[PDB]
Design a protein around this nucleic acid. Sequence first.
DNA 1: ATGTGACGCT
DNA 2: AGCGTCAA
Length: 424
Amino acid sequence: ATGQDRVVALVDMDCFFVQVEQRQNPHLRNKPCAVVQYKSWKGGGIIAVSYEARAFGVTRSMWADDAKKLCPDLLLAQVRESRGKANLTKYREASVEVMEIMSRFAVIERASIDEAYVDLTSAVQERLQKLQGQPISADLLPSTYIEGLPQGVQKEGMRKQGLFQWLDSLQIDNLTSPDLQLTVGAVIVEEMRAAIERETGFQCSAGISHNKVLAKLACGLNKPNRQTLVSHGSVPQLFSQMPIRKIRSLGGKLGASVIEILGIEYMGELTQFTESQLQSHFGEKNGSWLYAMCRGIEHDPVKPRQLPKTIGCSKNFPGKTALATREQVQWWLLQLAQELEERLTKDRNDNDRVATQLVVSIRVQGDKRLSSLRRCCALTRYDAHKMSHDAFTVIKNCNTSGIQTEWSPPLTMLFLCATKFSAS
DNA sequence: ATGTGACGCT
DNA sequence: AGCGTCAA
Ligand SMILES: Nc1ccn([C@H]2C[C@H](O)[C@@H](COP(=O)(O)NP(=O)(O)OP(=O)(O)O)O2)c(=O)n1
Ligand SMILES: [Mg+2]
Ligand SMILES: [Mg+2]
């Protein structure tokens, strides 16, 4: 088995929140700019960065006051603020624009606000019958890189030389060749990305490969505004110098333990181990997954899911602002519950469903985890005052303070999340 | 003082 | 039911 059964693509919008703001404000287009929230602390936290500003070293999470030191001409757009909280509605609506266009071409898995996987296997088979026998011109792939090629002057000349080498060697007479399927898959993704750009103004990158991990990896190789085809044959050289942390799901603790326990650095080095060895170090599931993945084989399906399964609303209360009175907790719970109710009502009207569970999460001062405590209760009425009261009820006994109107230990985060959706 | 979601393990 | 991991 070689894991060449499917054609899968990952589409990822380039500097997404920036593009949404640059579409709306033409003065920001083609400029070093960033999107920021909460202007009053250090000029605001940076959440997205145009590629022009990245060349100066501006990054996500950087304070805008500090970004200005690296990039004095940097232009800023502020996220909307509602009820004292950053409001991301504009970017969720822009995401829907993009997801609905992609859904015209194939069934998508919404992976994040600006990324979706697509299983192109069926669309590829149909295109191979309609474009039966006729070769694939390089003009059908104007923004495609073939990873690993050319082999054997300027950036665009390199791109085309590699594409020419790829197409020159392609067996068009065999409608079952996996390389031909990826290539036809890339033709469709070109058409998909053109449609996104035409109908929204947004540019994106894409990876085309045989599974989600390779498609995700391929996508980043030539970002922005380009797509990359990673074939099965390209995997050994690509993985031979690919740090383990770059493969999706190996960027955290498991990936660090793969490095530390096995004494390796690159994905290809995993091939030296038996499946049983990897299962012994990392578990039956992780071990089996690593054994196949380091050969470029992965079976996680593109799930047919265009809608989030949870709808959540959180606010941080760092340092000195940590909530320390019962009246503060109740007022902020109400603020979050009101935004959640607005989102839930739109969701019920748009998507014919209703959340039936409310999860309440709090972080206490000094805890390095995102969530110190999670409790749930029934979500029976999209009513902000009821949701906030119920949320307070399930967490009120976390209060350690002997004084009633006080709250201790102070709360550095509140989080309300509606979940367990059923048809409505 | 950075500020959403999806899924695994128990 | 509640916590931990991983990624946008
Ligand atoms: N930790 C993070 C990562 C991203 N985001 C937002 C801002 C991003 O523009 C948007 C898409 O995330 P992203 O793809 O990781 N980065 P972005 O699209 O801005 O730049 P690219 O590198 O994809 O071109 O999610 C966030 O709010 N918090
Ligand atoms: Mg992106
Ligand atoms: Mg993304």
